[PDB]
Amino acid sequence: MQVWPPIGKKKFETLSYLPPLTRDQLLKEVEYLLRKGWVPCLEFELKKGFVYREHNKSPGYYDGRYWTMWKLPMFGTTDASQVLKELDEVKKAYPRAFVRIIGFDNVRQVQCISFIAHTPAGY
Amino acid sequence: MQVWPPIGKKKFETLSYLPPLTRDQLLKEVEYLLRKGWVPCLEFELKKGFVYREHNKSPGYYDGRYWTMWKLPMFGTTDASQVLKELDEVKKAYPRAFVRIIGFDNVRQVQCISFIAHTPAGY
Amino acid sequence: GFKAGVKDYKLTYYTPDYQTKDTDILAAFRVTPQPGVPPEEAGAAVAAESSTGTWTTVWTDGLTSLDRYKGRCYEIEPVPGEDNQFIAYVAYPLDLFEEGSVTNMFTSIVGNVFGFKALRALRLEDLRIPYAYVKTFQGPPHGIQVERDKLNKYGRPLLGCTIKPKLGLSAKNYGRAVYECLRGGLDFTKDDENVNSQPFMRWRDRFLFCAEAIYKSQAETGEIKGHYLNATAGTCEEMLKRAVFARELGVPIVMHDYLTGGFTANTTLSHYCRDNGLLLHIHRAMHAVIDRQKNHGMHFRVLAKALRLSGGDHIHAGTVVGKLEGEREITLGFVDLLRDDYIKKDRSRGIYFTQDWVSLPGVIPVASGGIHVWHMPALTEIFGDDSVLQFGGGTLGHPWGNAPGAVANRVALEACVQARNEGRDLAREGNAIIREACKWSPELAAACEVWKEIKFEF
Amino acid sequence: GFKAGVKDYKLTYYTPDYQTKDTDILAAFRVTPQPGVPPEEAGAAVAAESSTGTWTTVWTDGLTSLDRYKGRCYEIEPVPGEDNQFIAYVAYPLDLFEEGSVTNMFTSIVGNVFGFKALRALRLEDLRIPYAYVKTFQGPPHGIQVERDKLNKYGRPLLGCTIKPKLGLSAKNYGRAVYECLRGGLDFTKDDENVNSQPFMRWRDRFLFCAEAIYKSQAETGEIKGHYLNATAGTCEEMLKRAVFARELGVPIVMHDYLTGGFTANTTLSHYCRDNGLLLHIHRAMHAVIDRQKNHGMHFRVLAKALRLSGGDHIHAGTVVGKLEGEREITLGFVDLLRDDYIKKDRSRGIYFTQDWVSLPGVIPVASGGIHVWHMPALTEIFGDDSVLQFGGGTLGHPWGNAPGAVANRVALEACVQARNEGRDLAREGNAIIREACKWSPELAAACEVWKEIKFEF
Amino acid sequence: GFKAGVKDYKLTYYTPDYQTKDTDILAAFRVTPQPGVPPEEAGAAVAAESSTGTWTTVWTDGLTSLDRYKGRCYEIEPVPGEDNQFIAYVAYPLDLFEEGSVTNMFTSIVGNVFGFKALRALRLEDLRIPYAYVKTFQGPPHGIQVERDKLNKYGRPLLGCTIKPKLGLSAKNYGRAVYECLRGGLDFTKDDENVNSQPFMRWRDRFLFCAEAIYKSQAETGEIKGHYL
Amino acid sequence: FKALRALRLEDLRIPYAYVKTFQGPPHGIQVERDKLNKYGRPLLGCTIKPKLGLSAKNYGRAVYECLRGGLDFTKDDENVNSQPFMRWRDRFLFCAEAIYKSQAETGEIKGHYL
Amino acid sequence: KDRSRGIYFTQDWVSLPGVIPVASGGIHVWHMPALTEIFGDDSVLQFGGGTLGHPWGNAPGAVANRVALEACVQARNEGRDLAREGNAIIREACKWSPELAAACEVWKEIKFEF
Ligand SMILES: CC1=CC(=O)CC(C)(C)[C@@]1(O)/C=C/C(C)=C\C(=O)O
Ligand SMILES: O=C(COP(=O)(O)O)[C@H](O)[C@H](O)COP(=O)(O)O
Ligand SMILES: O=C(COP(=O)(O)O)[C@H](O)[C@H](O)COP(=O)(O)O
Ligand SMILES: O=C(COP(=O)(O)O)[C@H](O)[C@H](O)COP(=O)(O)O
Structure with missing residues (x-):
């Protein structure tokens, strides 16, 4: 019988309960995104990497859901390596940032995929 | 494509998106204020240089809009150098203060001009 | 000229040359007539009784226009096996129905016709809801896109858990079980359908302790959490009291049993949830009383369309693989x-009619009931990402407790998501994906050992 | 000690030595198991999933007392056929139920068990409502005695009539048909179940024209009149708007479809009617979807008990002789x-349990559906004075119109009442009584000639 | 791919092969373009600015489906004569509109397009309100049949009368003029559109005196009377 | 009027005695600048585009991005009320999140005309 | 009264608050000097397409509009004529603001003259 730690286990939604993604596993996620016809986009955050409720507490209101957009959604990108080129660029400019890769479906108008691609050392 | 930083870009209203004002550019702002027939006044703050909402959160309520008045509005002043003499005096007394120069129009009873004239090193 | 007396229903109600209008509600009834009752008469009797007709000629028909208002059996389709079974297609004019009222739609279509002495059995298989009628309903308080946007959850099915035992736990123990489940990786926990307000646990006490559990588990994990608080009640006043308190606590989701609570109360709640930003989870308690038998009742697909019109953000949709009945193709x-x-239209999947929803929000289907970790690949493959997979016994039955139970389900789900995204076949490589995940997850390995060989095949 | 894994339901949920308590809710389920499923296990599975159990062992059971809360199959009764059908008697402790909530009672007892893969079919035949549970309900807003006292009507069944065609009439034509029916001797007229508020006739227009008709016919005849105004709506807010306006008109009776509206909305209306002196007529629209088949669903007697708890002054109870299904002994x-x-308890009448109502008011049963003048003696004999006999087609289908149609029904009823009171056998001298009354009633003679030979035998 | 800058409206908004849907709101605009503005561009500018478009390319268009949401000029029908005048037929998808809101319908369709520098004049001649949109409105509180049934008036036009002078009468004189009109055979009298509540006559005073007049004239004639308040 | 070909109302002199019966603006120029703490320049705004078709989440995302770059305000298009593509309450809540995030980031008061 | 400006009557507002006028519809960075000169400080200048149409996205779009506005404000306050030195003020601002330079190249030059 093992006890699940109540500290040091902060999560980042989809794929965060699996071992950290390798560059090959990350590439495969981007390849799936593109094969599905979705538009990749990068988002980053430096100050508040987790949801909180400071400004309002009504149902469905949470602060920290919006992160900062890295440039623009990559419309027209057909190559997964171009998305990973952008990831390396954001990691270099902001080494202490939390970074997500997202994929948009314009028909249903919803993010169809989201996963953490980088985190700071300590959080 | 360049990304606008989401950190280290705190602003101070009018003129804060331009390169920092030179002593001559500052003097010219005071000269415009006086030429327009407005009353110069200096205001300073040491603890909270930005707006926040601690005491109330109803529409149009914000804390941190009022700063401390430096002496009184300079009624009768016709010389811009006298305003800059007062700026140097506040800067000397409070080196870690945020300092604004404001100009009042008594007819419309509104501040017609406001610009940051000094800030602490780190904020 | 008015002539008193009984005439055959087929004289007015059987119209095989009728061209259906895009504004008509169409019904596909599986009819089993009594011996000696011709299909044209049985079909016309169904059309007449569920619309404007009665058993004998009434003079008042002449004050109105039956041509404009009558329900019409426009087609009889003979059926394989059962004798002398047939599908009677009935068209009802838009004017017969009260706007925004599922209650009124069911009252006419399904009100009296199932009890006809002239029939042995009757099953309503499908309803074509005209898009002009769809527009009179609010539909889901939020819908799939809005719900995912509010919860900040993308790219995988959502994970839930029902607190167990169904009944008997105190409010404090309920909140304790809730916090332990949520902190382990489940997005949601939930009251059971029958947990309302009882001597063992009063609702307000449960709501407060569960809110404490939601906020503790959310702060701990960094992920948005919810616990479906049951608003189902004896009256609408109690129902709304419960939704008002959930709103005061700032919690994201509430739940309702639409069939036992009823359509009138469900539509009231769906409107309240839209006005107050609450997500609404729906339980289909009692559906199998109505939808189980092939020869009589109403297929779940009709009850599912009725819920989408009345309003709900989630609806229980079966598991296929779990403890309760549900075939794959019909479920899909x-x-x-x-x-x-x-x-x-797709008869191989039981879709008798083409259905247009004219942008009404979509409902998230919920797979719940006797499911566990080994079912994860099959569940992910059948439902895809826009679903909620719920594990009551599959979480609270884990040998190490709730948090490890929740980790096991979350790891199993994420392992299936990554595998699928990598080009693997969940339908074939299922067991292998899970066994691979067991090697690095002790929580999953412990769940796998307990539930090996647990299947539901009848 | 907590041991994870699946165990048989019969280990905790089959208790053949259990002594039922007077506080227990008892259920008589007709179970058809899948081949290879023993009755003790199928019965225990029913008891478990309708109370506290799940498919696997949960550690949380130890925090509570299952002995106190569990549902228990205490008796298995093999029934004729094969099949391998049986009656499973299940006892549920009083603590499991929310006070005054029919919704909660149904959610637990009939919520999920009907969908079990391990069963082929399931029908809930009867429920013993413990008198301690009965006391938590208001029940009928008025009941038999109060209703008679309010309307000043004694010594005979009440007479009603449903306005026809079901749909399509304007508000003014509705009020015209109402006045004509009421002025001829009917105590009541009513909106059909599906008449709510529609493009052909909006509710508020109908309510005011029907009030004009009630007051005109009452002043003319000197007898108290009513028209059941339908409050059934899409939302509770709309349902209450309707009841509020009927209250403003000072009209005596309102109507609701309890199954399509739902129990939550029904209980709110029943409470509103009690607070505002309104009589509440109940339509059982949709019941035959649930209660028709012998092997699956819920017998109407359960739905009838549920209505008396939730609240209604009248309820449709079948005709026996009319167009819709209903056997004599089961009806009685x-x-x-x-x-x-x-x-x-009376198994020859389908009463599985002794039922004590601890002074909860009685509901007036309503006979309606394909009945006419020749059915009057049989109807008076089956139901007796405490009943409402309803003639839609049997009034509006009279060759001379509504008022003569109403006279015919009133004369036929009063002829049966006088004959019975004089010592005549209604079951044997039926046709003769009606034939005799034809000599002094031209209205009755005209109805008799139209409907002679119209029967419903299948 | 997103490409910043100005493009012609006709590239996205002029669709002459578009098949209108029964759910679309259709608009018949009489367009008078400025000289040098082709009808296909003026039509497309009307469709764009009354629906989803702007003067320059926005990246946000790619987050949604313009095919699903855009207004479309699907047909140009020239007007005889030469001022460059034509009828531009525009189709707007059902999703663009707020249910039961005439305000929202007018805000989109007639909101900004009439002020276009590229046009000399613009007239909206007709609108095809789709029946799916019609169903989201209550429409008249009563309508023809109900009104006749409520007033017990059949077989002839109804007769009314507007109280004169438009303004200046006191509440008592208003009621006196009302009773005299109604008692002579008119079914209705009415306030002028101008008569609301003014220093010469406050509304509540008028309403009470007009009610006295309605009931006196109805009792006298035996016919139902009304005064539009 | 049949007796006229055309008529255009060019101006109205509203008498000051009539002006006094109206509240007029809820706040007006000075009060607005005093509430927002913005002086010495025109205010800067931006209408979210496409006019119609964006979801509530995408609306709030576009809002936050505009406000954080130096605009004082963003705004719903005149067309944007409550529609199948985006219901109002959803938009209001996501735009409030965007306002508060951008205001905290820049240190200047922000608004989004709802 | 001023017929050259279409004011047929003298209008007295007896202290009723003033309304802030909003300049909106097809404007971009090159219009900033003309807008500042016509309206002055008591105005709202709105850029829909002029922000969401920037090649680098919303935040750089907003920076471009904010820099262009503040460049006009500083220039005017320094004694420069916005009606004559307009294009020069903007070109000067492009040299230190990459966001403004990127906007200037996209809208240089888009005009609306009929
Ligand atoms: C089930 C059924 C009903 C009919 O009215 C026609 C037909 C028999 C062809 C049909 O199979 C087709 C239904 C479809 C696809 C659309 C409709 O009707 O809107
Ligand atoms: O109580 C449970 C099962 O819990 P567990 O997860 O322990 O099996 C659910 O409410 C059922 O799934 C409902 O059935 P359906 O979803 O078919 O309506
Ligand atoms: O509209 C009718 C029949 O009117 P008519 O008098 O013309 O036959 C009723 O709904 C039936 O009685 C069925 O109900 P139930 O079986 O519940 O009584
Ligand atoms: O949506 C816009 C223009 O946006 P953009 O900034 O993209 O051109 C406004 O509705 C216009 O200003 C029209 O109104 P008016 O002329 O009344 O101001």
Whole structure:
């Protein structure tokens, strides 16, 4: 019988309960995104990497859901390596940032995929 | 494509998106204020240089809009150098203060001009 | 000229040359007539009784226009096996129905016709809801896109858990079980359908302790959490009291049993949830009383369309693989009817009619009931990402407790998501994906050992 | 000690030595198991999933006392056929139920068990409502005695009539048909179940024209008149708007479809009617979807008991002789359950349990559906004075119009009443009584010639 | 791919092969373009600015489906004569509109397009309100049949009368003029559109005196009377 | 009027005695600048585009991005009320999140005309 | 009264608050000097397409509009004529603001003259 730690286990939604993604596993996620016809986009955050409720507490209101957009959604990108080129660029400019890769479906108008691609050392 | 930083870009209203004002550019702002027939006044703050909402959160309520008045509005002043003499005096007394120069129009009873004239090193 | 007396229903109500209008509500009834009752008469009797007709000629028919208002049996389709079974297609004019009222739609279509002495059995298989009628309903308080946007959850099915035992736990123990489940990786926990307000646990006490559990588990994990608080009650006043308190606590989701609570109360709650930003989870308690038998009742697909019109953000849609009845193809068919904007006629999936939803929000289907970790690949493959997979016994039955139970389900789900995204076949490589995940997850390995060989095949 | 894994349901949920308590809710389920499923296991699975159990062992059971809360199959009764059908008697402790909530009672008892893969079919035949649970309900807003006292009507069944065609009439034509029916001797007229508020006739227009008709016909005849105004709506807010306006008109009776509206909305209306002196007529629209088949669903006697708890002054109870299904002995059985204070167990009438109502008011049963003048003696004999006999087609289908149609029905009823009171056998001298009354009633003679030979035998 | 800058409206908004849907709101605009503005561009500018478009390319268009949401000029029908005048037929998808809101319908369709520098004049001649949109409105509180049934008036036009002078009468004189009109055979009298509540006559005073007049004239004639308040 | 070909109302002199019966603006120029703490320049705004078709989440995302770059305000298009593509309450809540995030980031008061 | 400006009557507002006028519809960075000169400080200048149409996205779009406005404000306050030195003020600002330079190249030059 093992006890699940109540500290040091902060999560980042989809794929965060699996071992950290390798560059090959990350590439495969981007390849799936593109094969599905979705538009990749990068988002980053430096100050508040987790949801909180400071400004309002009504149902469905949470602060920290919006992160900062890295440039623009990559419309027209057909190559997964171009998305990973952008990831390396954001990691270099902001080494202490939390970074997500997202994929948009314009028909249903919803993010169809989201996963953490980088985190700071300590959080 | 360049990304606008989401950190280290705190602003101070009018003129804060331009390169920092030179002593001559500052003097010219005071000269415009006086030429327009407005009353110069200096205001300073040491603890909270930005707006926040601690005491109330109803529409149009914000804390941190009022700063401390430096002496009184300079009624009768016709010389811009006298305003800059007062700026140097506040800067000397409070080196870690945020300092604004404001100009009042008594007819419309509104501040017609406001610009940051000094800030602490780190904020 | 008015002539008193009984005439055959087929004289007015059987119209085989009728061209259906895009504004008509169409019904596909599986009719089993009594011996000696011709299909044309049985079909016309169904059309007449469920619309404007009665057993004898009434003079008042002449004050109105039956041509304009009558329900019409426009087609009889003979059926394989059962004798002398047939599908009677009935068209009802838009004017017969009260706008925004599922209660009124059911009252006419399904009100009295099932009790006809002239029939042995009757099953309503499908309803074509005209898009002009769809527009009179609010539909889901939020819908799939809005719900995912509010919860900040993308790219995988959502994970839930029902607190167990169904009944008997105190409010404090309920909140303790809730916090332990949520902190382990489940997005949601939930009251059971029958947990309302009882001597063992009063609702307000449960709501407060569960809110404490939601906020503790959310702060701990960094992920948005919810616990479906049951608003189902004896009256609408109690129902709304419960939704008002959930709103005061700032919690994201509430739940309702639409069939036992009823359509009138469900539509009231759906409106309240839209006005107050609450997500609404729906339980289909009592559906199998109505939808189980092939020869009589109403297929779940009709009850599913009725819920989408009345309003709900989630609806229980079966598991296929779990402890309760549900066939694959029929399930996939009603899942499309719940989620999609346009669903083409497809008899292989039980879709008798093309259904247009004219942008009404989609409902998230919920797989719940006797499911565990080994079912994860099959569940992910059948439902895809726009679903909620719920594990009551599959979480609280884990040998190490709730948090490890929740980790096991979350790891199993994420392992299936990554595998699928990598090009693996969940339908074939299922067991292998899970066994691979067991090697690095002790929580999953412990769940796998307990539930090996647990299947539901009848 | 907690041991994870699946165990048989029969280990905790089959208790053949259990002594039922007077506080237990008892259920008589007709179970058809899948081949290879023993009755003890199928029965225990029913008891478990409708109370506290799940498919696997949960550690949380130890925080509570299952002995105190569990549902228990205490008796298995093999039934004729094969099949391998049986009656599973299940006892549920009083603590499991939310006070005054029919919704909660149904959610637990019939919520999920009907969908079990391990069963082929399941039908809930009867429920013993413990008198301690009965006391938590308001029940009928008025009941038999109060209703008679309010309307000043004694010594005969009440007479009603449904306005026809079901749909299509304007508000003014509705009020015209109402006035004509009421002025001829009917005590009541009513909106059909599906008449709510539609493009052909909006509710508020109908309510005011029907009030004009009630007051005109009452002043003309000198007898109190009513028209059941339908409050059934899409939302509770709309349902209450309707009842509020009927209250403003000072009109005596309102109507609701309890199954399509739902129990939550029904209980709110029943409470509103009690607070505002309105009589509440109940339509059982949709019941035959649930209660028709012998092997699956819920017998109407359960739905009848549920209505008396939730609240209604009248309820549709079938005709026996009319166009819709209903056997004599079973009908007499549920009519006693609706009207009486104490009903002893009686299997020849389908009463599985002795039912004590601890002074909860009785409900007036309503006979409606394909009945006419020749059915009057049989109807008076089956139901007796405490009943409402309803003639839609049998009034509006009279060759001379509504008022003569109403006279015919009133004369036929009063002829049966006088004959019975004089010592005549209604079951044997039926046709003769009606034939005799034809000599002094031209209205009755005209109805008799139109409907002679119209029967419903299948 | 997103490409910043100005493009012609006709590239996205002029669709002459578009098949209108029964759910679309259709608009018949009489367009008078400025000289040098082709009808296909003026039509497309009307469709764009009354629906989803702007003067320059926005990246946000790619987050949604313009095919699903855009207004479309699907047909140009020239007007005889030469001022460059034509009828531009525009189709707007049902999703663009707020249910039961005439305000929202007018805000989109007639909101900004009439002020276009590229046009000399613009007239909206007709609108095809789709029956799916019609169903989201209550429409008249009563309508023809109900009104006649309520007033017990059949077989002829109804007769009314507006109280004169438009303004200046006191509440008592208003009621006196009302009773005299109604008692002579008119079914209705009415306030002028101008008569609301003014220093010469406050509304509540008028309403009470007009009610006295309605009931006196109805009792006298035996016919139902009304005064539009 | 049949007796006229055309008529255009060019101006109205509203008498000051009539002006006094109206509240007029809820706040007006000075009060607005005093509430927002913005002086010495025109205010800067931006209408979210496409006019119609964006979801509530995408609306709030576009809002936050505009406000954080130096605009004082963003705004719903005149067309944007409550529609199948985006219901109002959803938009209001996501735009409030965007306002508060951008205001905290820049240190200047922000608004989004709802 | 001023017929050259279409004011047929003298209008007295007896202290009723003033309304802030909003300049909106097809404007971009090159219009900033003309807008500042016509309206002055008591105005709202709105850029829909002029922000969401920037090649680098919303935040750089907003920076471009904010820099262009503040460049006009500083220039005017320094004694420069916005009606004559307009294009020069903007070109000067492009040299230190990459966001403004990127906007200037996209809209240089888009005009609306009929
Ligand atoms: C089930 C059924 C009903 C009919 O009215 C026609 C037909 C028999 C062809 C049909 O199979 C087709 C239904 C479809 C696809 C659309 C509709 O009707 O809107
Ligand atoms: O109580 C449970 C099962 O819990 P567990 O997860 O322990 O099996 C659910 O409410 C059922 O799934 C409902 O059935 P359906 O979803 O078919 O309506
Ligand atoms: O509209 C009718 C029949 O009117 P008519 O008098 O013309 O036959 C009723 O709804 C039936 O009685 C069925 O109900 P139930 O079986 O519940 O009584
Ligand atoms: O949506 C816009 C223009 O946006 P953009 O900034 O993209 O051109 C406004 O509705 C216009 O200003 C029209 O109104 P008016 O002329 O009344 O101001």
